[PDB]
Structure 1
Amino acid sequence: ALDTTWKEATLPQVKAMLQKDTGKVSGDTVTYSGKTVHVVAAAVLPGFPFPSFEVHGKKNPTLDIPGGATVDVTFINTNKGFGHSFDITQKVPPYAVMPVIDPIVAGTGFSPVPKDGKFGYTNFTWHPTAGTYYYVCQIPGHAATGMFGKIIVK
């Protein structure tokens, strides 16, 4: 039951999607507001550290989400040669090389690798209850080496 349905986007389409994250940045936190919020996350945008996620142009930021909101996540894999995933868990860091993160509350399978001048992306919806979550990549070693961030749902 992970989201394993992918579409393909050209680079100008990727840039257009990254700009549609509806959060507001303060330091290394992104704060969302409203009834429906749009999170747009990318795996290793050009020039950012490997391995990492970027959301609203920040590396692995803490996401602050209002209670009761509908969360629409768009995940784009921009990293040549790797098929990163985006998975939400309540299991905490530090993560092992093969992390134990079940149950996965929402998230993706492994993404397509970039090819033919295009990039794979997907959309999924999430209706969380209040608490702390983490977003992680499942490729062995990546979470252990820093590819994760925190989500606080009020």
Structure 2
Amino acid sequence: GTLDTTWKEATLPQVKAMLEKDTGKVSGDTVTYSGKTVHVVAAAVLPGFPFPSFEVHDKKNPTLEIPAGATVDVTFINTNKGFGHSFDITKKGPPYAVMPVIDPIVAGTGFSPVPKDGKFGYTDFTWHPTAGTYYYVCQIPGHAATGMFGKIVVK
């Protein structure tokens, strides 16, 4: 309501499914979406992946290139058994603040759920971007500054 609260939970095989069903090509080090369905399948510190960075299927937030004319659909799989990680899209840019300064959020998620065994907290939220550059951050203290952010180049 405040932010996008489209919270759900699947299970492990759906994570595998979603990871396949992603339009994010590997621009060498960076990730680059393509097609009008910019289906951003992302995850946050799943038990095995170390802190503090956000996972983006093939990589861990190098940076995201986006085709401006497309519809963005952020599919989180935040299943960090501790922190209700958020995905909050705005500007700010690096360095991100240690204190979670909630600068005017465009699209964002007000802290997605914290599952138990087997189940996988996901959140499908939609966004229509504008050309140039934005950044997304997890507005939990330290998290953004320490690593879980992503530069969104919309061109």
Answer whether TM exceeds 0.5 for this pair: yes
- Aligned identity (percent) is 94
User: Structure 1 length normalisation: TM-score?
Assistant: 0.92
Deviation at 1:116, TM superposition (A): 4.7
Deviation at 1:139, TM superposition (A): 0.9
Alpha-carbon distance between aligned partners in 1 of 2:53 and 2:70, rounded to the nearest angstrom: 26
SS in 1 for 2:135: strand
Count of matched residue positions in the alignment of Structure 1 and Structure 2 = 154
Q: Which runs of 5+ in 1 are unaligned?
A: none
Deviation at 1:19, TM superposition (A): 1.6
Which stretches of structure 1, 4 residues or longer, exceed 6 Å deviation after superposition? none
User: Structure 2 length normalisation: TM-score?
Assistant: 0.92
Q: Aligned-pair RMSD on alpha carbons?
A: 1.5
Deviation at 1:46, TM superposition (A): 4.2
Alpha-carbon distance between aligned partners in 2 of 1:5 and 1:70, rounded to the nearest angstrom: 17
Deviation at 1:2, TM superposition (A): 0.9
Q: How does 1:120-131 map to 2 (within 5 A)?
A: 120-131=121-132
Q: Determine if contact 1:25/1:56 at 8 Å carries over to the other structure.
A: no
Q: Which runs of 5+ in 2 are unaligned?
A: none
Alpha-carbon distance between aligned partners in 2 of 1:6 and 1:80, rounded to the nearest angstrom: 16
Q: Determine if contact 2:75/2:125 at 8 Å carries over to the other structure.
A: yes
Partner of 2:67: 66
Q: Determine if contact 1:30/1:56 at 8 Å carries over to the other structure.
A: no
Alpha-carbon distance between aligned partners in 1 of 2:148 and 2:32, rounded to the nearest angstrom: 20
Q: Determine if contact 2:70/2:128 at 8 Å carries over to the other structure.
A: yes
